[model samples]
Target: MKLDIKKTFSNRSDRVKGIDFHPTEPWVLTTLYSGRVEIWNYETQVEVRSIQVTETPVRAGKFIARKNWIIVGSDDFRIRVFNYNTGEKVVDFEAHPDYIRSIAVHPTKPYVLSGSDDLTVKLWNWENNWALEQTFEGHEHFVMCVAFNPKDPSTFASGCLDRTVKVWSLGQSTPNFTLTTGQERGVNYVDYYPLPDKPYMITASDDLTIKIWDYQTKSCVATLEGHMSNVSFAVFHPTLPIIISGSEDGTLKIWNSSTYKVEKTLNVGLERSWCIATHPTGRKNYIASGFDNGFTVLSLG
Candidate 1:
């Protein structure tokens, strides 16, 4: 399938690690190897904001859920929050000592969760100008992904090079549950199912498979396979019984949740894929991903 070119904004020195759309507009924020965050307008495919921090390669970028803020984490071990409209640094907090890999926000709070290459996940109190509330440590290797469970904001999960995914309570000192992903290489990304009642989770890994976990039971229930190379990231579809994964094999695949099977595949580039995102608008029915070549958005045809 040929991707209908929308807009292309350039500035990344190398691979783009993160990409996120605005809450209610056709705007996006992307992170690049040059230690900068570039905000772009989707319609014009042109950069509107270029914010550079004293960091090396901004690795993660996310839009704060309800409020007008954008969150970013970088190699400088700092979390930067910018006003959604002003593009001014709202808050900058020292949350970790190593490269921050990923970040997430609570569904309805002024809190942000972040994962760092230092092998820890930290909570940031955004209401207080992004204060570092607590540091949660357990991953033996670099922490790769972190997220606040949409189904239950009190619950969040983190995946790491330790080959384990652990769930934590909002204010607790210890993880509530830890599920060991038997991936020998490393677990790349993990996300919860969109359903409130189900509370399932999915993870992609260098083991060349995606595994579904029963969050309530804390066990691996299914493994979705067929990737020919390292699977970089996986996300559950917002409203459907499907999951999408990006791989170093240069392909993006959609998988069936119920049977843990591949339903569709789209070749995105010649180099490895990094991150994938969907519009927050449920009816949009389009998928967007970032890769070594660039980023692309596709609608279901």
Candidate 2:
């Protein structure tokens, strides 16, 4: 198995904070530290839209295709929504007290989750004009990542600098339970195993390792170690039996899901990978990786 990079899209000296793929198109959304967002049609290598939201950085963004909106999380503590159709601001409001680190949208609902440096995770229902639904306040430090469980839409998880991953259910102010990662450092990212047969959750950490935990049993099933620096992001391919992780070591590691062993290590000279995205079905070979310099769309083989 190997990662065959289809293209390296870089021009400016800007840091890529996050990236996401369009659900049904070849377009990619890139969030930047320069307070901008760009929607690029990767198939044609052409930029379709440019959003200059603020003078401050934008940490993350996601496409709400059904609503024709781009849900943007700003470093200025504001969550903004813009119409991707006509490129106009639709909704904008304060979300957190500090920088928003991550965001996840519900699978079939109008709900959204935001994790922030404010040490809290808030849930919102966009259908209700972005009304606040719940605020999860248990993490002792910055909430680095938040993810919705694909099998069960009512449940979600958040990774934190407090060395804990809290599993919360919708409408609950407190987490249903907490997964105590025995690591000495913070957890950088967390993602659920998309398919139902495996009730697993993967975690990326400052410990330079990726851990796959059987969340049902609350035990780490395996520890995949190879990264020389902090593991920035990690996720399971929706349909493939593989795991992909990117690190501050300026490399991306592809691990065999069944064996939990490193299959390939990749470096494209784009130091410090910050985020990664795959197609909704994981049917395509294209994978998006965000880095310190910019983002690259790669073809997996």
Candidate 3:
């Protein structure tokens, strides 16, 4: 496998903290540290829409195609859903007492999962007018990221600054399992294994390590170390046995899942990359990375 630079564009004045590629559209959504949410057309390299959601920083954003909405979390402790077609704010609510750090929508359901600096993971029923369904609590510090199991809509996981990852089910108010390692520092992000059984999860940490965790056994299956600084995020390839991680070390690394070895590393002369989004499979085969002041779309072959 080879990684290539496709197109690079810099249109933001502040750091971008979130990036999400649309499931079936040629669009991508990005949230910036300046509290702006932008929708971009990668196929044409055009920005479709940009809106300011808060005065405080925005942490993450995702496309909710079912309702034609883009949901974003912000440092102002709120989650705002906007209509991309009309460029109108649809739903806005106080999500946490502290910063809303991460958000994930269910794969096959109408629920949204959110992680907050308040150290809680919340599930919201969008079909029920964004009603609060449940709250899972276990972490001792800020919750960094939350991801729904792609194969199972009822299950999800959250990573936190407390140096732990907690797996949860929709029916429970507490975590199903807690994963922790004494040697590990704050978990900056978590992503689920793409396959059906959903047996494992991937985590990136401030300790500068990427780990694969067995959710059932509550143990780490493997640890990948190479980034010279804090590892900010780790996500699995949409249709491959691979994982990609971004770091403050100013690089993105591709790791072979089967062998747990470094396959490639990409650097594009940025101070640091805060977020990344891999294009959907069968498309252009590219990854979008957000730096402190700009964004780039890198092609993979």
**Number of the top-ranking candidate, with TM-score as the measure:** 2
Clashing pairs in 2: none
Clashing pairs in 3: 15-292
lDDT of 2: 0.88
Lowest-sum lDDT 10-residue window in model 3? 4-13
User: How do the residues 46-163 of candidate 3 rate in per-residue lDDT, one tens digit apiece?
Assistant: 8899998888889979999878999998888888999999988888999899988889988678889889989898889988999998888778998889988877768888888888
Best by lDDT: 2
| Regions more than 4 Å wrong, model 3 | 8-12
Could you tell me which 10 consecutive residues in candidate 2 have the lowest summed lDDT? 4-13
Candidate with better TM-score, 2 vs 3: 2
lDDT of each: 0.79, 0.88, 0.83
The model with the greater TM-score, 1 or 2, is 2
Judged by whole-model lDDT over C-alpha atoms, candidate 1 comes out at 0.79
Q: Write the per-residue lDDT of candidate 1 for residues 205-274, one digit (tens) a residue.
A: 9999899888877778888889999999998878666788999998988877778778778775537788
Per-candidate Cα RMSD to the true structure, in Å, reads 2.8, 1.5, 1.8
